[PDB]
């Protein structure tokens with residue numbers, strides 16, 4: 001067992017705040033924002049030894065990343081940014097930093113009651129995405 005086990009499971013999006021605004025900060029175009037913003041993704045988190053995998057399934061895009069904490073990796077994001085990512089565990093929060101073209105965004109995941117809360121921050125804009133177990 002590991003602390004990261006509180007994250008493992010299948011999670012369904014149940015609420016969103018400021019996603020469209022967050023996407024505008026990322027430079028996502030109109031059509032992509034509209035389609036992405038309509039999606040009700042599920043996220044599947046699993047752990048196998050030191051490897052964590054985060055898989056998103058949706059009607060917009062399906063993505064999968066696997067990584068080791070603290071070890072940089074290449075990621076092509078759902079909106080087709082090519083980024084360098086590093087994911088750490090900081091006091092129980094999964095912290096994911098994406099770097100591309102001199103820009104940065106941070107995605108934090110935390111357990112809160114029976115929910116998994118994803119916070120996406122770009123510049124002054126915070127989006128909150130709340131999931132429950134599927």
Ligand SMILES: Cc1nc2ccc(Cl)cc2c(-c2ccccc2)c1C(=O)O
Nearest residue numbers: 023028036039041056058060061078079
């Ligand atoms: C973490 C992440 N970051 C994003 C950044 C930008 C855009 Cl456009 C989309 C995402 C998505 C996503 C949202 C809806 C459907 C599918 C994927 C997610 C994700 O939940 O997996």
